[PDB]
Amino acid sequence: LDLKFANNRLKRAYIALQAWKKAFYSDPFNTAANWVGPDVCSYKGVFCAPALDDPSVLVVAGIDLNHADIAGYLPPELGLLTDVALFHVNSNRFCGVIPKSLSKLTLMYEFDVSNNRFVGPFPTVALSWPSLKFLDIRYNDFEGKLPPEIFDKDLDAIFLNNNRFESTIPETIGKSTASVVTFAHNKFSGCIPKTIGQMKNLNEIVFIGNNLSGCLPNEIGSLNNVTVFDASSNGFVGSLPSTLSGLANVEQMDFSYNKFTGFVTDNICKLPKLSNFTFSYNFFNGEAQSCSSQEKQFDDTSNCLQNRPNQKSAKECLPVVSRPVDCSKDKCAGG
Amino acid sequence: RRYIGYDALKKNNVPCSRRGRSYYDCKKRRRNNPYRRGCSAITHCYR
Ligand SMILES: *[C@@H]1O[C@H](CO)[C@@H](O[C@@H]2O[C@H](CO)[C@@H](O[C@@H]3O[C@H](CO)[C@@H](O)[C@H](O[C@H]4O[C@H](CO)[C@@H](O)[C@H](O)[C@@H]4O)[C@@H]3O)[C@H](O)[C@H]2NC(C)=O)[C@H](O)[C@H]1NC(C)=O
Ligand SMILES: *[C@@H]1O[C@H](CO)[C@@H](O)[C@H](O)[C@H]1NC(C)=O
């Protein structure tokens, strides 16, 4: 050791990066060949800024490693890498569970491990970060239950797409400030909790490709300022509730590849902001009188509308009990 | 026209093309300060 740094805090960052360089098993872009020398602020991927503690001293404030296919694991020596808030490590072949030592990153604000080969349970270390507002663990192989403690934190975005979650959606979902949440392409079992409308700020939401069931909890209508609502490729059964007319700000909705029954309401479906309203590949004894004229976009394929084309064989449309589930006495819709 | 809830299904896309900048302040990088947060919610600030 014969190197001196501008401050003592960047000295630990050099220790972490060099040890984390030693954990790089592959780098086709040669983006890590620059990681030699004490002048860390010129390394490719890391960025410096005047420290919020004192503007006199500059510190490594963020790490950005967008696509740049990079392989390896995250060693525990990254705990010395303090004060970083943005960690963009997306679309690179990293592996290994997130180290527990990353809990020392008290200033973590946005954490981007999307499109990685991380194979763990859920990162219970990603919950100790108080300032965290953006969290995406999408296109990863996470397993097990989603802890209900995630929504209790003041988060702004949660991404969980293309994972292997196997529990049910926690009842704590209503406590989240999260503007956008994504549960797509996951094995979420159970029903949607009846605690949604306790959001008051949820903008976008998606439920594509889940093994979810149950009649739709009508409390979703309280989302007055909501933009995207999607429940495609799910196993939902029942009729559409009439209280969804409160979604005045909704712009797009999708309910395809489900087993919905009942009536389509004409009331809310004429919203000046709603676009591309797809309900195809479903069961709907109701009619879409005002809900395929060409001022907006509607889809009615495999919906069993006798007046409309592209319907389903009358032997396939309600050859079973034509009664929908009562959506009463059901544990997911009322008493 | 720009919805990030649907663009999240694309593993390769990012909320900000300009590298280094925070996903909330994805504007011109006069100083490229990682500690500056322009927008508040991640729906009104998509690029
Ligand atoms: C209006 O809404 C409808 C319904 O949501 C929408 O139709 C859907 O469009 C999306 C694309 O925006 C289709 O998604 C594709 O589906 C095919 C299978 O049919 C998949 O193979 C595709 O995945 C490929 O592409 C991905 C992205 O590049 C890759 O990540 C992936 O690995 C694959 O290479 C893709 O998911 C969707 O199938 C249709 N819906 C139906 C019923 O087919 C329509 O586009 C909307 N109109 C707009 C946007 O104005
Ligand atoms: C949605 O409207 C509620 C009701 O006032 C408000 O408290 C909340 O901040 C709004 N959220 C937005 C604009 O996303």
SSE arrangement of chain B, N to C? H
End-to-end Cα distance of chain B, whole Å, is 12 Å
Write down the overall geometry of chain A.
Answer: elongated
Please summarize the sheet with the most strands of chain A. Answer: 12 strands, mixed
**What would the principal axes of the Cα set say about the shape of chain B?**
globular
Give the total of domains of chain B.
Answer: 1
| Beta strands of chain A, count | 20
N-C termini distance of chain A: 70 Å
- Helical segment tally of chain B? 1
Radius of gyration of chain A: 24 Å
What's the story with the biggest beta sheet of chain B? none
In total, how many domains does the architecture of chain A comprise? 1
Estimated structural class of chain B = little secondary structure
Topology:
The complex is a heterodimer of chains A (335) and B (47).
Chain A lengths: L8 H13 L2 E3 L19 E5 L7 E7 L6 E3 L12 E3 L5 E2 L14 E3 L6 E2 L13 E3 L4 E4 L12 E3 L4 E2 L14 E3 L21 E3 L21 E3 L6 E2 L13 E3 L4 E2 L16 E2 L19 E2 L36
Parallel strand pairs in A: 3-5, 4-6, 5-7, 7-9, 8-10, 9-11, 10-12, 11-13, 13-14, 14-15, 15-17, 16-18, 17-19, 19-20
Antiparallel strand pairs in A: 1-4, 2-3
Chain B lengths: L3 H4 L40
A molecule of 4 linked components (NAG-NAG-BMA-MAN) binds next to loops of chain A.
Nutshell version of this structure?
Chain B: This is Protein RALF-like 4. The complex is a heterodimer of chains A (335) and B (47). Chain A is mainly beta and 335 residues long.
What labels would you give this structure?
heterodimer; A: 335 residues; mainly beta; 3-stranded mixed sheet; elongated; B: 47 residues; little secondary structure; globular; binds a molecule of 4 linked components (NAG-NAG-BMA-MAN); binds 2-acetamido-2-deoxy-beta-D-glucopyranose; plant protein; Leucine rich extensin
